[PDB]
């Protein structure tokens, strides 16, 4: 299948409370493998997956050096963005940056991306072509013009099409046991009385990987999407994921309902019926 590597950077100004908080995390597909936290003791990029722990001193020294460079850039960004929007000095603000790349089944470059946000809102984004920019507003225009002149896009395209996919492939190899696995969901249904004339039917999908999954309820084959409570897919904490969907069924109509499960790890979609 295809794969992705993505880095997430968050920077939060804390006026009169020291330098801004900076947090960086890296993911291959749905698996985290590194992190940096400016409030942590080490002041180094750190491993968050077993398959990356033995990468070696050169790798860790290099990522630590670069992630500090990122941290410092974002430290200046916060002042700059306050200066573009003429905002008060006492308020806390947030910058967010995400970049990464995807490879196909062949492990060929598929796409690259670079997105930037200020206070929870799109600010500037690299377009699909990796040659131009999309500015969210007027302030973002200043940046757009500045990066267009600094040929920053060319630099990113080089990274995304080169270093990014080269190392994604290396990680996929290194953690081929963790990353190149699919864990099919273990499923079951539960039944709980709501009254004397109603019951909650809950369809569970547990311990699956990757996170992508589809859980749907049907009554006589008709999608009950509007009457389904569906929680967000959530981490179990062990690298696997969980999800459930529930419907309230009039007591006695259980046999009309089926839960349908689709996951990459399954040979064919599952259809669960209470009976």
């Amino acid at each position: 299948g295809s794969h992705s590597m993505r880095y997430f950077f968050t920077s939060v100004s804390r006026p009169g409370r020291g330098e801004p908080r900076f947090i960086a995390v890296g993911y291959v597909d749905d698996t985290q493998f590194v992190r940096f936290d400016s409030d942590a003791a080490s002041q180094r990029m750190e491993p968050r997956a077993p398959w990356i722990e033995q990468e070696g001193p050169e790798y860790w020294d290099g990522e630590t050096r670069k992630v500090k460079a990122h941290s410092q850039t974002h430290r200046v960004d916060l002042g700059t963005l306050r200066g573009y929007y003429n905002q008060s000095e006492a308020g806390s603000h947030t910058v967010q940056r995400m970049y990464g790349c995807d490879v196909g089944s062949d492990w060929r470059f598929l796409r690259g991306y670079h997105q930037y946000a200020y206070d929870g809102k799109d600010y500037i984004a690299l377009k699909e072509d990796l040659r131009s920019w999309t500015a969210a507003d007027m302030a973002a225009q200043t940046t757009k013009h500045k990066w267009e002149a600094a040929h920053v896009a060319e630099q990113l395209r080089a990274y995304l099409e080169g270093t990014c996919v080269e190392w994604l492939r290396r990680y996929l190899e290194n953690g081929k046991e963790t990353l190149q696995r699919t864990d099919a969901p273990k499923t079951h249904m539960t039944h709980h009385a709501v009254s004397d004339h109603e019951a909650t039917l809950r369809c569970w999908a547990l311990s699956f990987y990757p996170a992508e999954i589809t859980l749907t309820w049907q009554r006589d084959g008709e999608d009950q999407t509007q009457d389904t409570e569906l929680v967000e897919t959530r981490p179990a904490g062990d690298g696997t994921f969980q999800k459930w969907a529930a419907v309230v069924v009039p007591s006695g109509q259980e046999q009309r309902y089926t839960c349908h499960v689709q996951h990459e790890g399954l040979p064919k979609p599952l259809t669960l019926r209470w009976e």
Partner: peptide
């Protein structure tokens, strides 16, 4: 692996 060098907005 991360990018280098990053550019200010």
């Amino acid at each position: 692996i991360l990018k280098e060098p990053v550019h200010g907005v």
